[PDB]
């Protein structure tokens, strides 16, 4: 029974998805997030080996001691909703707010964060899960540990090698082949969103707002950024999906060398 086992606190966020609250598991005072997903706005459903949101299937698949992805601790069904209990880092800030407050990130910091996001996304893909909504709003920073956590699997799918013709993630992080053709492959679309994310980190906002910008093929740098970083970004944002790097090629890029440890990142940049 949900209401007996968690003490509900303040609302943390709400939107199309539903509403998420701060909570504490009464058992051991563990910080949690309590996410209410209305059944009306659930598009994709799966089956665990009952009928659940696809979000729950994907979360169960990536669930692990690895801290780069949010851990689903439990879930409950109600008449008109599902309630998802997620681990909550404390103290925490999302990457959207962090970038808004701090502006364009130093490259050392962006390298550490981007590397951690890569490792998180590789974890998802290794577990058979395509996220489909990689963005700064869907990344939490454990401020004490300097560890990033990928959240919000509400637009995800099972990973496959064929074309996707559906998409409900964030349009400004979506690739030109989706904008033009309503078609994309999972990995190359993911790399496109990672390009957008990296630009966002080093310039302080995303490069494109409009469809014509997304398909136009020009990346203008509004901030002073190293040539090596520009090169990686522009590779991730190649118009042709087959011109984009693999995850291996990203992590082997010269800009990606000599990453800080999470603990070093916290000490130098967060504490």
């Amino acid at each position: 029974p949900l209401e007996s086992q968690y003490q509900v606190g303040p609302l943390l966020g709400s939107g199309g998805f539903g509403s998420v609250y701060s909570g504490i598991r009464v058992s051991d005072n563990l910080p949690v997030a309590i996410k209410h997903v209305e059944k009306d706005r659930i598009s994709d459903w799966g089956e665990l080996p009952t009928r659940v949101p696809m979000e729950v299937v994907l979360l169960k698949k990536v669930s692990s001691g690895f801290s780069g992805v949010i851990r689903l601790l439990d879930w409950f069904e109600r008449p008109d909703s599902f309630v998802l209990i997620l681990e909550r880092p404390e103290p925490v800030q999302d990457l959207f707010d962090f970038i808004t407050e701090r502006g364009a990130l130093q490259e050392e910091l962006a390298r550490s964060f981007f590397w951690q996001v890569l490792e998180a996304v590789r974890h998802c893909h290794n577990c058979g899960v395509l996220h489909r909504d990689i963005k700064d709003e869907n990344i939490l920073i454990d401020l004490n540990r300097g560890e990033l956590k990928l959240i919000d699997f509400g637009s995800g799918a099972l990973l496959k090698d064929t074309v996707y013709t559906d998409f409900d993630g964030t349009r400004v992080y979506s690739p030109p082949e989706w904008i033009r053709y309503h078609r994309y492959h999972g990995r190359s679309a993911a790399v496109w969103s990672l390009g957008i994310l990296l630009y966002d980190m080093v310039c302080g906002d995303i490069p494109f707002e409009h469809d014509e910008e997304i398909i136009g093929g020009q990346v203008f740098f509004r901030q002073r950024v190293s040539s090596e970083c520009q090169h990686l970004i522009r590779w991730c944002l190649a118009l042709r999906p087959s011109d984009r790097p693999t995850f291996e090629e990203i992590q082997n890029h010269p800009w990606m060398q000599d990453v800080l440890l999470p603990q070093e990142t916290a000490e130098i940049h967060l504490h």
């Binding site: 199309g16 998805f17 709003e137 637009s155 964030t170 992080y173 906002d205």
Partner: peptide
Amino acid sequence: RKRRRHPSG
């Protein structure tokens, strides 16, 4: 220049 969130969908 205005930075904003972009809801999914």
